[PDB]
Amino acid sequence: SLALSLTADQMVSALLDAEPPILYSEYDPTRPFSEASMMGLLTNLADRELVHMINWAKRVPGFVDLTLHDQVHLLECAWLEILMIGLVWRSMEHPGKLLFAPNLLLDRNQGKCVEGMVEIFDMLLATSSRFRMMNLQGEEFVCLKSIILLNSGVYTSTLKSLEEKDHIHRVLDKITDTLIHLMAKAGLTLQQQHQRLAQLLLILSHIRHMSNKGMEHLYSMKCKNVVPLSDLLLEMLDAHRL
C-alpha cells in the first residue's frame, strides 16, 4: 500500500489536492423561503456535494485499497458528518452564520423557517465558533475530515474483515503522525502538540452528535413529505435505518 509509505508532507499535499469544490445552491433570491423550499435547497446541495465526496474519498490514501462493500459502508456511515464538518469549516469566517454555499449564508433566525432546524443550526454555529477559537487550519481540517471517513463506520470474518480493519487503523495512525507533524512545523511545543491533537479529535464527538441529530431531522422531513429526496440521498439516509 503506497499510501503507508507517504511522508507527512505527502499526506497533507494529497489531501489538499483531493479537496472538493465549493458548490452553489439553487437559491432564487427573489422568492420567499418556506420550510419546503429551504429543505429543498439543503438536500439539492447535499446531493450534488455527494457526487464530489465519492470522488474525494477515492483520493484519500488507503481508501481505494478497501473492498467496494467496505467503501460503501464507510461513506454511508459518515456522509453527513463529512458534509457538516465542511459546512462548519466554510462558516469559520462568518460569525453567527452558516455558509452552506456562497449564495446560501443562513443565520439561526432563518433556520427557524424549518421546524426542528434551529437546534441543529445552533450546534453547527457553536462548532464553527470552536473552530474559530482554536484557529483551525485547513491542513488540520483535511486530516479531520479524512479521519471521519475512515473511523466512523470502522467498527460496524477472520482475516478478511480483520485485515481491512488493520489497514484502516494503519492509515488512521499515519493521519495522526501527520497532524503532529503539522503542529510541530507550526512551532507548538511537545505538550501543546498532544493537547491540540486531543482538542481537535474531541470535536469529532460533537460532529458525530450533529450528524445523528441531522439524520433524525432529515428522516422526519422525509416522513412528513416536506421535500422529495433524490434516490442517492434516500439510499444514504436509509442506510441508517438498517
Binding site: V51, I54, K58, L68, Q71, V72, L75, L232, E235, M236
Partner: peptide, 9 residues
C-alpha cells in the same frame, strides 16, 4: 444501489 455504482466510475 446508486452509491455502489458511483464508486465504480
Amino acid at each position: 444501489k446508486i452509491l455502489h455504482r458511483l464508486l465504480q466510475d
